Design a protein around this ligand. Structure first.
Ligand code: NA
Length: 103
């Protein structure tokens, strides 16, 4: 198993939507998957190495839910805004930033 740690981020999205996403991480601090409960079911989206590059990271298969964001690693992951697209190509969580909890 290359996943050795997992970390969770809470987001606030447009249209008052909220989503919590758990990311798996390997020993190098890269990510291995994104997971979120979507319509009361957990959806597991492995990192898509066909689509991901130096600028953009994508999780999920073609035909499924896809999380898209910027560069993701153990340094960056809690600062990156995300979006989640449904299998039918509708954006179901839009313009999601990680929540400020600072006093
Ligand atoms: Na993030």
């Amino acid at each position: 198993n290359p996943t050795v740690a997992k970390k969770t981020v809470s987001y606030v999205c447009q249209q008052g939507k909220k989503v919590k996403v758990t990311y798996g991480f390997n020993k190098q601090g890269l990510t291995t998957y994104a997971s979120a409960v979507i319509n009361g079911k957990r959806v597991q989206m492995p990192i898509n190495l066909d689509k991901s590059d130096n600028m953009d990271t994508f999780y999920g298969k073609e035909g499924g839910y896809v999380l898209s964001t910027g560069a993701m690693d153990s340094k960056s992951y809690r600062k990156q805004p995300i979006m989640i697209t449904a299998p039918d190509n509708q954006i179901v969580f839009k313009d999601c930033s990680p929540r400020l909890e600072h006093h």
